[PDB]
Amino acid sequence: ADTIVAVELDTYPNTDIGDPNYPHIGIDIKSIRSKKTTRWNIQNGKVGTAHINYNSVGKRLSAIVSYPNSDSATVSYDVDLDNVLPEWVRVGLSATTGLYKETNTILSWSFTSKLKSTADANALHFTFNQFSKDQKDLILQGDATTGTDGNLELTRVSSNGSPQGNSVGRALFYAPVHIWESSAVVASFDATFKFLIKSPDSEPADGITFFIANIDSSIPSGSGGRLLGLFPDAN
Amino acid sequence: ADTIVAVELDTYPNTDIGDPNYPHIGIDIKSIRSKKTTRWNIQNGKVGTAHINYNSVGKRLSAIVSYPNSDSATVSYDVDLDNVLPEWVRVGLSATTGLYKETNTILSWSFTSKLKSTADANALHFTFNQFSKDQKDLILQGDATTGTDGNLELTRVSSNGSPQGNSVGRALFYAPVHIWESSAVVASFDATFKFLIKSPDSEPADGITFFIANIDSSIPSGSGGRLLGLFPDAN
Amino acid sequence: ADTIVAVELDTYPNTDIGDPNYPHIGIDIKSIRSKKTTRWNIQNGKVGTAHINYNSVGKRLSAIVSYPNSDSATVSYDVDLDNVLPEWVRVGLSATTGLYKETNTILSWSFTSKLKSTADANALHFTFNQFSKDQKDLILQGDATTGTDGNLELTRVSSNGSPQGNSVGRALFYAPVHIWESSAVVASFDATFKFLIKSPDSEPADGITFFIANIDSSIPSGSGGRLLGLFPDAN
Amino acid sequence: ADTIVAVELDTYPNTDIGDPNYPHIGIDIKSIRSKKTTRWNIQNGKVGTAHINYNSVGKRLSAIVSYPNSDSATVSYDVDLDNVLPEWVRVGLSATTGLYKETNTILSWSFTSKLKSTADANALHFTFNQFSKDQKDLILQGDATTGTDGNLELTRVSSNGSPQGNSVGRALFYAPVHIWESSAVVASFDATFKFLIKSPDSEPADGITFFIANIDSSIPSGSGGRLLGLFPDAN
Numbered sequence: 001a002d003t004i005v006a007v008e009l010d011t012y013p014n015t016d017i018g019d020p021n022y023p024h025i026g027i028d029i030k031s032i033r034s035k036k037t038t039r040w041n042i043q044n045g046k047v048g049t050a051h052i053n054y055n056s057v058g059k060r061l062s063a064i065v066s067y068p069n070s071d072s073a074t075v076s077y078d079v080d081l082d083n084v085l086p087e088w089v090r091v092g093l094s095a096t097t098g099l100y101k102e103t104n105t106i107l108s109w110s111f112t113s114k115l116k117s118t119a120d121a122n123a124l125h126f127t128f129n130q131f132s133k134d135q136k137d138l139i140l141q142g143d144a145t146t147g148t149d150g151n152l153e154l155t156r157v158s159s160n161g162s163p164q165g166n167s168v169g170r171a172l173f174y175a176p177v178h179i180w181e182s183s184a185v186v187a188s189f190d191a192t193f194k195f196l197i198k199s200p201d202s203e204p205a206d207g208i209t210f211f212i213a214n215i216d217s218s219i220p221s222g223s224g225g226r227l228l229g230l231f232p233d234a235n
Numbered sequence: 236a237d238t239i240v241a242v243e244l245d246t247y248p249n250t251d252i253g254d255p256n257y258p259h260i261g262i263d264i265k266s267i268r269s270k271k272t273t274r275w276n277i278q279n280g281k282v283g284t285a286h287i288n289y290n291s292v293g294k295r296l297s298a299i300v301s302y303p304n305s306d307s308a309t310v311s312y313d314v315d316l317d318n319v320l321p322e323w324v325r326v327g328l329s330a331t332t333g334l335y336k337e338t339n340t341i342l343s344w345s346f347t348s349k350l351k352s353t354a355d356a357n358a359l360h361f362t363f364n365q366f367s368k369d370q371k372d373l374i375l376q377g378d379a380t381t382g383t384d385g386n387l388e389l390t391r392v393s394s395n396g397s398p399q400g401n402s403v404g405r406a407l408f409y410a411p412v413h414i415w416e417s418s419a420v421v422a423s424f425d426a427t428f429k430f431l432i433k434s435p436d437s438e439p440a441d442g443i444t445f446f447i448a449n450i451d452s453s454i455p456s457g458s459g460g461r462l463l464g465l466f467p468d469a470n
Numbered sequence: 471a472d473t474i475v476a477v478e479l480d481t482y483p484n485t486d487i488g489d490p491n492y493p494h495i496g497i498d499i500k501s502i503r504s505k506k507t508t509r510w511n512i513q514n515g516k517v518g519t520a521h522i523n524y525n526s527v528g529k530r531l532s533a534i535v536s537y538p539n540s541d542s543a544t545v546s547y548d549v550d551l552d553n554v555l556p557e558w559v560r561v562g563l564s565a566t567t568g569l570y571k572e573t574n575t576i577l578s579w580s581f582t583s584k585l586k587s588t589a590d591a592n593a594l595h596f597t598f599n600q601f602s603k604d605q606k607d608l609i610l611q612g613d614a615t616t617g618t619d620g621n622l623e624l625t626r627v628s629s630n631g632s633p634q635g636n637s638v639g640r641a642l643f644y645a646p647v648h649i650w651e652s653s654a655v656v657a658s659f660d661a662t663f664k665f666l667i668k669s670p671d672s673e674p675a676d677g678i679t680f681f682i683a684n685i686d687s688s689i690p691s692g693s694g695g696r697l698l699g700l701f702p703d704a705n
Numbered sequence: 706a707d708t709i710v711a712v713e714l715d716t717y718p719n720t721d722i723g724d725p726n727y728p729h730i731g732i733d734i735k736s737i738r739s740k741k742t743t744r745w746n747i748q749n750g751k752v753g754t755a756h757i758n759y760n761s762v763g764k765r766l767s768a769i770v771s772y773p774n775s776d777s778a779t780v781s782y783d784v785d786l787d788n789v790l791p792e793w794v795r796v797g798l799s800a801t802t803g804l805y806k807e808t809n810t811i812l813s814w815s816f817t818s819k820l821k822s823t824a825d826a827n828a829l830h831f832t833f834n835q836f837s838k839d840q841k842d843l844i845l846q847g848d849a850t851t852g853t854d855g856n857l858e859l860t861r862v863s864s865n866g867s868p869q870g871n872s873v874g875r876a877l878f879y880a881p882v883h884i885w886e887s888s889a890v891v892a893s894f895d896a897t898f899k900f901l902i903k904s905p906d907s908e909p910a911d912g913i914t915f916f917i918a919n920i921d922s923s924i925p926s927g928s929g930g931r932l933l934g935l936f937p938d939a940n
């Protein structure tokens with residue numbers, strides 16, 4: 001089955017499957033049940049920015065989410081990604097809606113990956129500060145589309161700008177990413193994306209994710225709403 | 236047919252199809268007949284480095300090739316790549332052998348591409364300082380292989396290290412590259428690679444190329460030897 | 471005397487000292503009389519962005535200035551900066567006002583410099599996306615201040631936000647920049663800055679400059695208004 | 706007094722002041738007595754590479770040191786550098802010798818620093834892959850010299866290539882570095898350097914350091930040998 005590592009911007013408390021009782025950011029290691037969460041004060045309709053960082057020396061996967069002028073939310077978890085993920089992965093963003101909804105709009109997305117073994121590390125770096133209708137270097141899955149106002153729309157939003165329920169969508173970068181190998185000395189990656197989460201009715205759902213998966217990964221069956229498009233069950 | 240822009244490290248004078256009468260670097264715009272060439276003193280069996288640069292403001296495509304301690308060879312040509320290439324391309328290295336031969340060994344390859352329209356340019360950057368036997372982010376065509384001594388071998392070299400005749404090989408980066416669009420303000424790219432050209436008998440052939448092509452490009456039929464794997468005829 | 475290379479955003483036609491009869495961008499090589507100019511439609515009070523690029527292979531210094539949704543203005547000039555500038559320089563922004571005025575406000579400023587001689591080039595890169603009141607890595611000269619709304623104010627603006635006449639100001643990066651040497655193979659630099667030019671009365675003056683100078687350079691006497699803070703006379 | 710954070714490549718066991726009884730890498734937080742050490746198998750006369758990384762989200766300062774083909778040594782320590790260092794610092798390398806000696810030769814040194822508050826982080830990046838006799842962007846202190854074989858020699862080495870006793874030397878980058886501020890959201894830095902440690906007699910001393918200090922820092926009196934040029938006492 002897929003091997004998934006993710007940072008989840010979890011907008012909807014699913015307390016029956018281990019969510020804390022408040023919107024949160026979490027680190028997910030091959031399970032929707034986050035290994036660590038921090039309370040996240042989502043600001044409806046504002047543009048937020050997420051930064052994620054890892055290196056094989058410290059073996060600490062960190063994420064921070066912030067809005068303008070507001071306090072940040074940070075979460076970290078000590079995990080040896082070398083032992084967890086395959087040597088070759090694809091990187092991506094995912095989002096879902098359920099009975100409740102939200103725009104899962106991505107305004108920009110940047111990613112850097114380095115793999116060392118003399119400074120001769122191998123590196124991959126990409127930055128989308130703007131998305132075009134034909135984004136050939138993105139693999140779109142599910143309901144995700146590109147082009148609308150130069151944005152990446154992970155979940156189904158009707159033409160009026162209203163978000164739809166029970167949507168799922170993902171975008172993976174086209175090239176595969178080399179994140180470890182047998183001989184490896186140091187590896188590190190770094191990811192950032194700006195997002196816009198708007199929900200009209202009382203509360204939004206279900207969230208946005210930055211994730212790392214085996215190269216052939218696609219939306220698992222049953223992965224909607226609270227499973228953020230990454231996992232088939234809630235184990 | 237393919238749309239090809241290339242910088243050729245032309246090791247073998249094909250004077251009957253417009254080569255100058257000496258090894259040369261050239262800028263090729265949709266023809267093997269270089270728009271501009273400079274004399275290039277190849278040093279058999281040495282490691283050389285090539286740097287290529289372009290931006291849409293100056294509209295000048297430049298290349299320099301150098302060996303340690305030795306004088307460099309530089310060539311430039313004013314060309315509006317916006318008007319010449321498609322908006323989406325793939326980037327690559329090619330090499331051939333003919334009746335004469337050479338190792339077309341690539342030790343490293345780095346590439347940067349930026350596309351602007353606030354500093355929010357889109358960017359792609361990759362660096363192979365080392366090639367592994369399974370290089371999933373490279374599309375190998377023809378006789379090109381990866382892994383041997385951490386190198387990219389574009390043309391057929393027998394296990395002993397001897398180069399074979401009438402070989403052709405190319406490697407293109409897996410992700411497509413966005414190099415222009417309708418709205419574009421500025422675009423630029425930058426490429427560098429280290430290569431090792433060894434030939435035992437008197438003189439080598441045929442050369443190495445860095446090239447930019449339509450995404451679906453493959454080795455055209457009839458493109459061996461003097462056509463460096465890029466062109467079907469010598470027009 | 472100082473050795474100055476600059477890209478000038480010349481907002482005020484000084485036709486008596488060789489300006490064209492319209493606001494323009496220009497390339498200045500040790501003289502205020504631009505070696506090449508392009509017509510520039512300044513948009514009062516809008517945020518514009520300038521990109522400048524050079525490399526020692528093509529020997530073509532280019533600049534582009536653009537505003538949102540509007541056509542760009544581009545200018546290029548073939549010049550061998552190796553032969554023109556000293557091996558060690560400082561890089562900076564300058565601006566002036568005269569009898570007419572303008573805000574010469576800098577919102578961001580990024581600069582990259584590379585010097586090569588194996589990919590072992592030397593490099594300097596800095597980015598100010600925000601300026602703080604105590605910007606210790608900037609050398610402020612003349613009327614330039616830092617901090618106001620996170621901006622760099624090159625020329626005197628009164629506390630109300632109104633620009634003052636006969637101001638001059640420059641900011642140079644604190645570290646010296648190594649842009650060539652005897653052994654050099656390739657060198658290149660790249661600079662970008664976002665600026666805000668507002669003038670209330672009919673027309674603004676005098677302009678903004680990105681420049682490269684000998685390390686000890688300061689505002690020459692007599693360099694105000696039309697001499698943009700770079701040159702003592704109009705030769 | 707100076708505020709010092711450093712990663713020490715400690716070649717000589719000073720067990721009387723808390724060193725483990727073997728050469729080690731350590732993380733030093735305002736004391737020569739390392740907060741954490743790892744055993745380091747130094748290879749006399751080989752070229753080694755050190756990588757150091759920190760970010761304000763994970764608050765984990767990591768270092769790895771490796772030689773070709775050999776196992777690496779890694780060390781980490783959870784420390785909130787925001788609370789420890791001043792907002793403005795200088796970054797540098799230091800080295801010493803004592804009764805025993807070693808070449809403290811630096812072949813290359815690269816450093817990246819980012820400070821965020823939209824992707825508009827402030828950044829400083831420099832890379833010396835080669836040092837020239839007149840390195841104007843380095844502040845040399847003590848016995849450190851630049852130019853010899855394109856290398857940075859931190860401690861006194863006689864013209865023959867033999868290392869001298871009771872030497873001390875440091876090099877700091879010329880520009881000050883902005884590593885935090887009141888408004889800050891995220892900060893991170895990253896440093897790498899290649900070094901050559903050769904000692905003829907039985908064992909070398911005393912070590913090499915990458916350090917971060919208040920901008921005006923200089924070699925404290927009494928800081929030789931085992932105090933690696935950073936600290937006046939061994940507290």
Ligand SMILES: CO[C@H]1O[C@H](CO)[C@@H](O)[C@H](O)[C@@H]1O
Binds near residue numbers: 012205224
């Ligand atoms: C009733 O719950 C549904 O709606 C919530 C919120 O959208 C989801 O978390 C969940 O998976 C279901 O799809």
Ligand SMILES: CO[C@H]1O[C@H](CO)[C@@H](O)[C@H](O)[C@@H]1O
Binds near residue numbers: 247249334335440460
């Ligand atoms: C006889 O010519 C052949 O050999 C030379 C040198 O290899 C090639 O340039 C050419 O295309 C042919 O294949």
Ligand SMILES: CO[C@H]1O[C@H](CO)[C@@H](O)[C@H](O)[C@@H]1O
Binds near residue numbers: 676
């Ligand atoms: C009368 O001219 C003055 O004003 C213009 C416009 O500001 C400047 O160009 C010039 O140098 C003088 O200072």
Ligand SMILES: CO[C@H]1O[C@H](CO)[C@@H](O)[C@H](O)[C@@H]1O
Binds near residue numbers: 719804910911930931
């Ligand atoms: C006797 O000790 C001296 O020599 C060792 C090894 O060089 C140093 O650690 C120490 O500071 C002294 O200078």
Ligand SMILES: [Ca+2]
Binds near residue numbers: 010011012014019226
């Ligand atoms: Ca949830």
Ligand SMILES: [Ca+2]
Binds near residue numbers: 245248254
């Ligand atoms: Ca030829």
Ligand SMILES: [Ca+2]
Binds near residue numbers: 480
């Ligand atoms: Ca003028």
Ligand SMILES: [Ca+2]
Binds near residue numbers: 717718719931
């Ligand atoms: Ca010691």
Ligand SMILES: [Mn+2]
Binds near residue numbers: 008010019020024032
């Ligand atoms: Mn959750």
Ligand SMILES: [Mn+2]
Binds near residue numbers: 245254255259267269
């Ligand atoms: Mn040719």
Ligand SMILES: [Mn+2]
Binds near residue numbers: 478489490502504
């Ligand atoms: Mn002018």
Ligand SMILES: [Mn+2]
Binds near residue numbers: 724725729731737739
């Ligand atoms: Mn120690």
